[PDB]
Structures are given as structure tokens and as C-alpha cells.
Amino acid sequence: NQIDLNVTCRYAGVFHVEKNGRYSISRTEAADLCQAFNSTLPTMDQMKLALSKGFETCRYGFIEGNVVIPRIHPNAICAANHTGVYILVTSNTSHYDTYCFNASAPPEEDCTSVTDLPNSFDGPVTITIVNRDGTRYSKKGEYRTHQEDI
């Protein structure tokens, strides 16, 4: 009973979370996961500001209302060379990574590591936060409030 959550730097409070190294989060699970980080799904305006401060990924993830990839530098294998907040338009499938927004984070780039899931609930799952630099924090808990996601 283990969940790995790989997290990124924050840019204007926005960050990316990938679960178990695969696209595996539903929209309901995404909202619960951001709530466990005392965060919310970013609005499109919050994501655009994060992009302007240096945020980009090569992964689809939920924001409020859409599934997107923020891109600064054109890359053929990330959002097909697009720049800006690329919005996924057509897909058969429902599981992606997520973005989260924490209003208390620094205004610009914050590339310090994340050392807690502060709003996780009591539960039996070993949840490990994994940073890009490999540093980890593990705790026993739960964050899902919908049964279809368990």
C-alpha cells in the first residue's frame, strides 16, 4: 500500500505532481491531492503567471477546467513544439498528472524541496513525496475522498 508523488519547483505557487511515475490521476483525485498539499487546482490565469516566471513541464496535467502542458521552449516531443499554456483538446482517456497552486508559496521561482504533505488524513497508505533532487519524505496517510479512485 504505497503511493509515490513526484513534485517540482513552485513558480508563483504552481507546481506539478506525478503519481507513481505514470499518468494515473483522475480529476476528482487531483482535487483531493492538491487539498493534501493545502493547495487548489490552478486557474488558467494562475498557470499563465507561473509560466511567465519560468514554469514548464513535458507532462499533461489538470488545472481547473482543462488538461494542459506549460511550455516555454519549443520541443517537438512536448506539446508538439507549442509554447504557452498548451491545452489538450482531444483525448480518449481521463487520467493525467496534476498541477496544484499554493497561495502561501513565494511569488516567483521556488526550487527548494518539499518535505511534507501537510493536510493528509489518517490512513494506511505509505505516501512518499519525491523531489527532483531525489530527497524524500514518507508518511502514513490517505488523501482520497472518492471511492472510485481507491
Q: Which residue's CB is nearer to ligand 8BI, number 18 or number 86?
A: 18
What does the binding site for ligand 8BI look like in residue numbers (CB under 6 A)? Answer: 10, 15, 37-39, 102, 105, 112, 114-115, 118
CB of 112 to ligand 8BI, least distance (A): 4
CB of 67 to ligand 8BI, least distance (A): 21
For the chain, the straight-line distance linking the first and the last C-alpha, in angstroms and rounded, comes to 11
Contacts of 93 (CB under 8 A, 6+ apart): 23
CB of 39 to ligand 8BI, least distance (A): 6
**E strand spans, 20-143:** 61-62, 67-71, 84-87, 97-101, 109-110, 121-130, 136-142
Identity at 11, one-letter amino acid code: Y
Which residue has the closest beta carbon to ligand 8BI? 102
- Annotated binding-site residues read 22, 59-60, 86
